[PDB]
Design a binder for this molecule. Structure first.
Ligand SMILES: C[C@@H]1NC(=O)N[C@@H]1CCCCCC(=O)O
Ligand SMILES: [Ca+2]
Ligand SMILES: [Ca+2]
Ligand SMILES: [Ca+2]
Length: 595
């Protein structure tokens, strides 16, 4: 698809070269323009390859003299938008605004150009393949390019600031998505002065079609500069007392008020890395930290203590299980067999099995609640693990209820998952907090990078160890008799977790001494590289990534508790405005100091 527009741009330049009219507009050849329009009368409405006019060409190459001649010789061309699918809707005013050609904009002003004309072309979509997203309307273009002169010049002649684009985004939303934040704060504040000024229907409330006001979009986008500028509207100051300044914050669109209206939920859900810094801002970081110090951290330790007691109950119900009498003469055939197994299907004997019978009941009623609080639908893995645990005890109470021969196969998956899920609560206390973040980011990151190389390497040498020690009885030295144990043992030789095949009472094969020497050297090389490849994330920037991503996870956890927990526990943060001078809304007191 990228070649299509490249072909069409090269095709356009060919049609610019072929068409002498469009050529004179590109080169500003005013002397040639008259000869083609008067002395050898051609079509002045001559369309280009992009459905453009000679005026559309004279617009992007900033030569007003060629555009002036076309609008004087045919004032019908101004209203015409480009008809091609790439550039559909773009008038000659759009190009004049985005190129900051103020004189062409003011000349198209006198022609009565459409200020409400929508540029719906595929090159104006908010997509990665478009280098920028300036919007739909020419007023949106004037605000994004950073020309306050064109913004006011457009509003003077009927430009509607409320006009929402293809994605229902107002011009205020579009300024948040721009790069130059420090300058665009004046443009945002400038555009708001033209608003009606009524307390209702203010343009700061007109939301994106994805339910997002401009103040709320700044947080999700990670625009730290706009979010601070957008905070002064929502900031009340109680008093100034020496160096201290008790300031009262609004907390309306911030914090858990509605379902998905809360900014905090939008910050933790969005994948934007910059959005985590809105959490560290003065109005919010004081909120979430106080939501954590009280009603946040204690309940997380309660659920932690409950879960630890819930699992240590289920774990204690797994060490004590129905007895496993071999009771078969199958143990003598196939010396490899090493099992004493099975159930005898009875839990009704009522001695001390009733203690683990209610322990099994607690596990099932706990799992069905776990499966009925999570499946009704970052700390993702440590929440998928919980439902797979509940899934694994629904396969350790159903197939195990019907007397399965291998009923311990899914009980081990249930055990390690829910047990290693306890360090989910490691984000509770500060010491273990950032440590659990480091192990999680390193699994998807650096485990795959070394495991695929380890897999390719062990596959090489485990096969070369199979092929040599298949040519030998495994009664002695039999470290890898068949291919499953060939991959398993060599995988273990790779991690120094076996003594390595070593038998000296009897002689070894000729090639093992040579092959394992190369293996031990490559095994340590890849092991040292694995040690120093994950070392790369020890930079001073990562030190913040170690700490902040834990805080971001704690705040993400802090919202996870309050959203589902009842209202009687954990009251609404801040103090309500009713019974005070304010108006039934909840505000946060934060006093600081300036040195
Ligand atoms: C130069 C092209 N000729 C023309 O008349 N309009 C085009 C404008 C190009 C803008 C592409 C914006 C984008 O990348 O989406
Ligand atoms: Ca060792
Ligand atoms: Ca040993
Ligand atoms: Ca070591």
């Amino acid at each position: 698809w990228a070649q299509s527009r490249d072909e069409q741009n090269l095709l356009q330049q060919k049609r610019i070269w072929e068409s002498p009219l469009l050529l004179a507009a590109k080169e500003n050849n005013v002397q040639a323009l008259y000869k083609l329009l008067k002395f050898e009368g051609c079509e002045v409405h001559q369309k280009g390859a992009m459905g453009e006019t000679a005026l559309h060409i004279a617009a992007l190459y900033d030569n007003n003299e060629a555009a002036q001649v076309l609008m004087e010789a045919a004032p019908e061309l101004v209203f015409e938008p480009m008809t091609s699918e790439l550039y559909e809707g773009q008038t000659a005013l759009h190009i004049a605004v985005i190129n900051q050609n103020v004189n062409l904009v003011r000349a198209l002003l006198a022609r009565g150009a459409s200020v409400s004309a929508r540029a719906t072309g595929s090159v104006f979509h908010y997509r990665p393949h478009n280098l920028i997203y300036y919007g739909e309307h020419p007023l949106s273009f004037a605000a994004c390019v950073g020309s306050e002169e064109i913004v006011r010049l457009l509003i003077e002649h009927g430009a509607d600031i409320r006009a929402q684009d293809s994605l229902g985004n107002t011009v205020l939303h579009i300024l948040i998505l721009q790069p130059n934040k420090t300058f665009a704060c004046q443009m945002y504040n400038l555009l708001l002065s033209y608003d009606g000024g009524d307390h209702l229907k203010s343009l700061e409330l007109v939301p994106n079609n994805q339910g997002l006001t401009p103040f709320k979009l700044a947080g999700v986008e990670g625009n730290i500069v706009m979010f601070q500028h957008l905070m002064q509207k929502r900031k009340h100051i109680q008093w100034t007392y020496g160096p201290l300044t008790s300031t009262l914050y609004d907390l309306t669109e911030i914090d858990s008020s509605g379902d998905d209206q809360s900014l905090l939920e939008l910050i933790v859900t969005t994948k934007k890395r910059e959005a985590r810094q809105i959490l560290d801002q003065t109005p919010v970081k004081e909120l979430v930290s106080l939501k954590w110090k009280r009603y946040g951290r204690p309940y997380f330790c309660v659920l932690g203590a409950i879960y630890v007691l819930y699992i240590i109950c289920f774990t204690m119900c797994c060490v004590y299980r129905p007895l496993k009498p071999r009771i078969t003469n199958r143990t003598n055939p196939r010396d490899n067999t090493l099992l004493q197994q099975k159930l005898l299907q009875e839990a009704y004997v009522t001695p001390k099995d009733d203690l683990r019978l209610v322990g099994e009941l607690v596990s099932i009623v706990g799992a069905v609640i776990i499966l009925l609080v999570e499946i009704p639908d970052l700390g993702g893995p440590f929440h998928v693990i919980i439902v797979t645990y509940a899934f694994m005890v629904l396969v350790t109470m159903v197939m195990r209820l019907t007397n399965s021969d291998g009923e311990v196969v899914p009980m081990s998956f249930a055990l390690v998952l829910g047990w290693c899920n306890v360090m989910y609560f490691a984000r509770g206390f500060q010491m273990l907090g950032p440590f659990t973040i480091m192990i999680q980011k390193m699994i998807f990151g650096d485990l795959m990078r070394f495991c695929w190389l380890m897999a390719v390497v062990i596959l090489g040498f485990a096969s070369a160890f199979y092929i040599i020690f298949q040519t030998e009885d495994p009664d002695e030295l039999g470290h890898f008799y068949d291919y499953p144990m060939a991959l398993f043992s060599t995988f273990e030789l790779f991690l120094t977790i076996i003594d390595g095949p070593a038998n000296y009472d009897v002689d070894l094969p000729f090639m093992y001494s040579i092959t394992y020497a190369a293996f031990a050297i490559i095994a340590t090389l890849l092991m040292l590289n694995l040690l120093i490849a994950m070392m790369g994330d020890t930079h001073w920037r990562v030190a913040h990534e170690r700490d902040e991503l834990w805080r971001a996870q704690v705040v993400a956890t802090t919202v996870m508790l309050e959203r589902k927990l009842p209202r009687c526990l954990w009251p609404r943060s801040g103090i309500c405005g009713r019974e005070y001078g304010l108006g039934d809304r909840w505000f946060l007191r934060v006093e600081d100091r300036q040195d």
